[PDB]
Amino acid sequence: QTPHILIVEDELVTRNTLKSIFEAEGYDVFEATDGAEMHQILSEYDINLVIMDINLPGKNGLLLARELREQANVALMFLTGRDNEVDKILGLEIGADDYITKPFNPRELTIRARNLLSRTMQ
Template identity: 55%
Template structure:
């Protein structure tokens, strides 16, 4: 199921909305500021953000502008303001939808479902689970678990690189191809930055990252995912 990030500085409203969405089966994270939201986005794969415009410090419009420059993530602005200017500006800078408080939860849920469907994260496609070297990699929920059943956190870019490598297990994949698989170029346009993601993945997957046995370097060509995948 999709992962939703609720960015709201009012704790009661934030907790109530997060609880409601969790009860609908979504994975939910909470942030009370732009700084906390950015930390979560750097550590986890998030499919949709509910962003309060009226945040202290960096407000919801600035968060929207910055995240839209980095990602195709779904963004719904949530605010107590009913100023038409805010709605228009929010949509112009990249928000997908806009709701005003107080809102009907069922209406908001319908908007969330519609947006997730449009962005391809609704989960209607067949579930894909890959197992290798004790790991379980569910590409629909974007969840990686180790042999102990513990979640291994992946950023969106790490997920996309690992997903393509697993899909091409046993084949050599070039840096350019891996770069092309990233839906947002938050690491710049240099394919060499893929090496950074590979090092981070090795740190999470390999028993000895200095001597990798899962993601191997093919000198002069790229990388190969070598384990048997079931």
């Protein structure tokens, strides 16, 4: 099953990085700039994993993740370029499977996605 990942990230640079990282794993990558685009994609395509920025114009990413979790149990990892404990624990608490801070090893990211996808993609 070709894993499908959705990246919710408004910064073009960060989003292109992430996207090329996962295309290199053989994933199909979908992109979203905000919460409307996120729900649009989640409605119309199969999505096995969401990577979301906590920090995000419009509705914040914690809130988007809360909403996501009310509707779906899809695998979810948060991103932050701010190491900040409260945001880390909150995001885990609302049900993110992982929390990754800048700067990250791409390898850590794709191995964590692979292990998580191995458990959730049934």
